[PDB]
Ligand binder design. Structure first.
Ligand SMILES: [Mn+2]
Ligand SMILES: [Mn+2]
Lengths: 434, 434
């Protein structure tokens, strides 16, 4: 595998190569990617989407937008530091080809900013509501008119794969979606495989899949340009992760681990009495305890803890990446960067506490139950309208929600998934009379 | 004026100088500033604050957070391009001192990200609600126990000055607030003067003021370190704007001009029939009309128009800055970058259309009226509780809203101003029984 190819500036449709040495550094393709996401309608919709806790007006809770912002800031810092060490290890990359360390921060920052852009509302219940609808619900009907992989895309519908669709969807007047650089699309793709075969190993890259059948041709072009290593020689295609995808994943791991905990303390789902017990190993050498004791607000004490722990995990993740860089470059690294952490046990303890106190709180459970009905209802109305587009009621459903059979079902799923929490509830409420 | 001093890396409390040449480029002080704002509680609260249109669940409206994100992306691009041209004009800045063009993008990006962080809820009615409360309302009482400037801070309370307070406020365990680099604080300060004298000229830098009496000592340290030019030799202090403040302002001007228009079309406050008539001069040479005509959604047509016009105004603003760079460096530039635009008349037409159709819409008027009562109510309850902290009711008001006389009144104003739209309405509602 070669870093020169992995850092591709190609955009979908390019008829001629884009050499890094010929880029205007004030218009660097990788940094244009970041700005294109900031201004995109899919990214704006993250402002009104729950990350974990249902939104309120009585308290601040992280939305998908604020979470994605934080992951891109952590990812930019990981890419910057890993970039400098990579340029020191492969100095031809800078001296010949012209890559700079901020290039790597820009790729990770942009892929991180977009990493959750395709996720359905109401969390992973959203994903399973969609999947079960086609497994056993009304969607079962279509099984026999679909290939095994087309159907697998639906019964195991994945927000990561919908994110890739969102980023590249071609519509009239706008071919290629956001047209992000192939390097950013590679750093985005943490599961570079189709929906089948299902979990062919215990590798984290095989836990899910990363693109739908409708996007397969695009990711084939991406993987070829990047020179990603094959992980399958059958007609079920699969590739080793772009190395920078490991940094997007780590930024994400770091943020939801530490920041879910922070939110849980500020919302009162986790007793503040637990904050230091769970963070002491992550912060013990850098914490200024006198400063911590002088802070008079809970939210200030816990944000100080969060900033210390995130700093700790960033430095360690940079070191883990470089110690396993050749294994990662050869596609033989079998785990995540955080799985190798010396704080693995503490991370696991924090995550389990959050699962117990936040994910299993009444409000999060209530939301996931409500989500299952809201999304199943919307999917039933979309699909009935698709099957009999002639009735008056179905023409209304089309006007309200959406003004090849697989291409239609995958598009219905993508459109339901990119609904904000509010719009989905309002449409649900009107379909049901309220 | 010297660019070497204007690019200061000093943080409040520094006992030793910070040379740019000795910075770790993966931990550049200016880029740390950006990340410190992203993670700060004041910036997070912008997620739940209206920019112009009241928030809804039926439609996407820009919050203060999304607006600030967009301004920092436009500002980063302005600073990058202006930086490269400045480094080409003063090559000693890079070859001797070590400044890079991305330094300038980082300063403008961070000051832009924070530029609205202190603004009170419900818009400029929020500011005038606060001002009138002390001019003629309950706050009149204190006039005689306050200096003319201390009082002027209250009756002309300014969100820009509250933003500076927010960014630097010292509390137990956290001296200096976010401790941003003095260069970022200089780019943030577009009105580098105290509340008095009031509008001593028609210069845009004298239209308001930029720091409260409680922050005067800090900005004196900032202006000295930066080497800003004096604009007053009386005991009323005042300085010429940091040159990069002109780029923060332009990024802001560009975004609320074009993006308010975009939001007004998508919300149906402005007829879509007007979109091309008002944008044609801004986009006429770069628009692909066939592409525009092929787009099937309004929101896509208008986002294409917005991206073309923003691109147009960025390039022009970079050129205006460099053509007036010595006047700006000498503090003799008398206007904003956008005031010099060749599209001045079109910008004015767009702004007036937005005022007529959005700012004077029923919903925005309803919000500003409601805001005046909500904030006046909260200020009355805070100030009565301050005057008689012994009564049971006032002890409750203290527990609900806040668990030297000027220092108390300026702190009450800052605390009311940093309330989200929802928390302010809830507290208002409980004080009034609902
Ligand atoms: Mn995430
Ligand atoms: Mn603004």
């Amino acid at each position: 595998a070669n870093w020169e190819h992995l850092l591709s500036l190609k955009r979908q449709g390019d008829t001629a190569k884009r050499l890094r040495i010929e880029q205007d550094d004030t218009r660097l393709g990788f940094e244009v990617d970041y700005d294109a996401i900031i201004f995109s309608a899919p990214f704006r919709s993250l402002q009104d989407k729950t990350q974990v806790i249902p939104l309120s007006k009585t308290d601040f809770v992280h939305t998908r937008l604020t979470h994605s912002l934080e992951v891109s800031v952590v990812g930019r810092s990981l890419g910057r530091m890993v970039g400098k060490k990579l340029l020191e290890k492969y100095p031809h990359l800078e001296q010949v080809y012209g890559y700079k360390f901020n290039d790597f921060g820009a790729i990770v920052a942009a892929a991180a900013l977009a990493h959750d852009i395709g996720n359905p509302p109401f969390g992973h219940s959203g994903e399973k509501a969609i999947g079960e609808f086609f497994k056993n619900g009304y969607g079962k009907r279509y099984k026999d008119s679909l290939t095994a992989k087309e159907y697998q895309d639906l019964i195991k519908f994945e927000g990561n794969a919908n994110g890739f669709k969102v980023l590249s969807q071609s519509k009239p007047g706008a071919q290629g979606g956001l047209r992000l650089s192939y390097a950013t699309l590679g750093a985005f793709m943490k599961y570079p495989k189709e929906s089948l075969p299902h979990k062919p190993s215990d590798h984290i890259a095989d836990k899910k899949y990363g693109f739908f059948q409708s996007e397969r041709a695009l990711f084939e072009d991406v993987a070829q340009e990047l020179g990603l290593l094959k992980r399958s020689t059958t007609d079920d295609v699969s590739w080793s992760r772009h190395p920078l995808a490991y940094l997007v994943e780590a930024a994400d791991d770091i943020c939801y681990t530490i920041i879910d905990f922070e939110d849980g303390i500020n919302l009162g789902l986790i007793p503040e009495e637990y904050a230091l017990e769970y963070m002491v190993k992550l912060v013990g050498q850098t914490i200024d305890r006198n400063k911590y004791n002088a802070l008079q607000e809970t939210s200030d004490r816990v944000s100080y803890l969060r900033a210390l722990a995130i700093g700790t995990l960033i430095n360690e993740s940079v070191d883990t990446f470089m110690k396993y860089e050749e294994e990662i470059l050869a596609g033989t690294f079998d785990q995540s960067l955080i799985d190798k952490s010396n704080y693995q046990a503490q991370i696991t303890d924090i995550i389990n506490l959050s699962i117990e106190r936040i994910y299993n709180s009444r409000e999060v459970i209530e939301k996931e139950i409500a989500g299952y009905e809201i999304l199943s209802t919307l999917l039933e109305a979309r699909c009935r309208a698709l099957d009999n587009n002639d009735t008056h009621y179905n023409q209304l459903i089309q006007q309200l929600l959406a003004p090849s059979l697989y291409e239609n079902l995958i598009q219905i799923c993508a459109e339901v998934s990119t609904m904000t929490d509010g719009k989905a509830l309002r449409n649900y409420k009107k379909i049901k009379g309220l």
